[PDB]
């Protein structure tokens, strides 16, 4: 059975949702060298995504590694409200927002920690968050990267890099590439498994 749609909400572009999330730009210092995770490359809309993963992203990173049990949910929740999807799959659980209804069925969805958009079906098996785990920072923030091979910067996706930052908007940066506990990088492992699934782009999150 499919999901109930969302009761209420605005809906928003790819742009907008991005920009009504809460986002932490104090981790990202201007003219400074700052250790992140390449969270995505987005090599058909140009920009990157960086996520600092850091100590206070800790309850996200428990229930990415299926570490604290969640209520399922048979509703949606309201356009721009934060919660989680399953891919089950890969067995990882991620912060999502719908932001909008496809015309052809189905729904527009942003992974907030991530920064990649998705279709959502609404067969997908989806849960709330404790309230401290909805609240917390979206970790993808948008990066312009510059003086670098941004295809090649694609194999780095999901593995901590250095980057010295240009600019810092507050909502965007622009940043160079210069060319950390043991839990880190073996939930980083985990996100890749999902991230590099032969499927993710044409099916998106699978149920069950």
């Given at each position: 059975?499919?999901?109930?749609?969302?009761?209420?909400?605005?809906?928003?572009?790819?742009?907008?949702?991005?920009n009504?999330?809460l986002?932490?730009?104090?981790?990202?210092?201007?003219?400074?060298?700052?250790?992140?995770?390449?969270?995505?490359?987005?090599?058909?809309?140009?920009?990157?995504?960086?996520?600092?993963?850091?100590?206070?992203?800790?309850?996200?990173?428990?229930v990415?590694q299926?570490?604290?049990?969640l209520?399922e949910?048979?509703?949606?929740?309201?356009?721009?409200?934060?919660?989680?999807?399953?891919?089950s799959?890969?067995?990882?659980?991620?912060?999502?927002?719908?932001?909008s209804?496809?015309?052809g069925?189905?729904?527009?969805?942003?992974?907030?920690?991530?920064?990649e958009?998705?279709?959502?079906?609404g067969?997908?098996?989806?849960?709330?968050?404790?309230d401290?785990?909805?609240?917390?920072?979206?970790?993808?923030?948008?990066?312009?990267?510059?003086?670098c091979?941004?295809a090649?910067?694609?194999?780095?996706?999901?593995?901590?890099?250095?980057?010295?930052?240009?600019?810092?908007?507050?909502?965007?940066?622009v940043?160079?590439?210069?060319?950390?506990?043991?839990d880190?990088?073996?939930?980083?492992?985990?996100?890749?498994?999902?991230?590099?699934?032969?499927?993710?782009?044409?099916?998106?999150?699978?149920?069950?």
């Open positions: 059975r499919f999901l109930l749609p969302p009761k209420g909400g605005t809906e928003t572009t790819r742009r907008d949702i991005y009504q999330i986002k932490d730009m104090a981790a990202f210092p201007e003219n400074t060298i700052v250790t992140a995770v390449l969270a995505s490359v987005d090599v058909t809309d140009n920009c990157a995504y960086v996520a600092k993963w850091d100590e206070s992203s800790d309850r996200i990173k428990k990415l299926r570490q604290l049990p209520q949910l048979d509703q949606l929740p309201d356009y721009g409200d934060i919660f989680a999807v399953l891919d799959i890969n067995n990882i659980i991620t912060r999502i927002t719908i932001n209804s496809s015309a069925g189905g729904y527009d969805a942003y992974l907030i920690d991530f920064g958009h998705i279709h959502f079906d067969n997908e098996t989806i849960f709330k968050l404790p401290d785990i909805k609240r917390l920072p979206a970790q993808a923030i948008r990066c312009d990267l510059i003086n091979d941004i090649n910067m694609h194999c780095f996706v999901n593995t901590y890099i250095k980057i010295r930052v240009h600019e810092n908007n507050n909502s965007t940066l940043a160079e590439p210069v060319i950390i506990t043991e880190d990088m073996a939930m980083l492992n985990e996100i890749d498994e999902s991230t590099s699934d032969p499927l993710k782009a044409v099916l998106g999150f699978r149920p069950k």
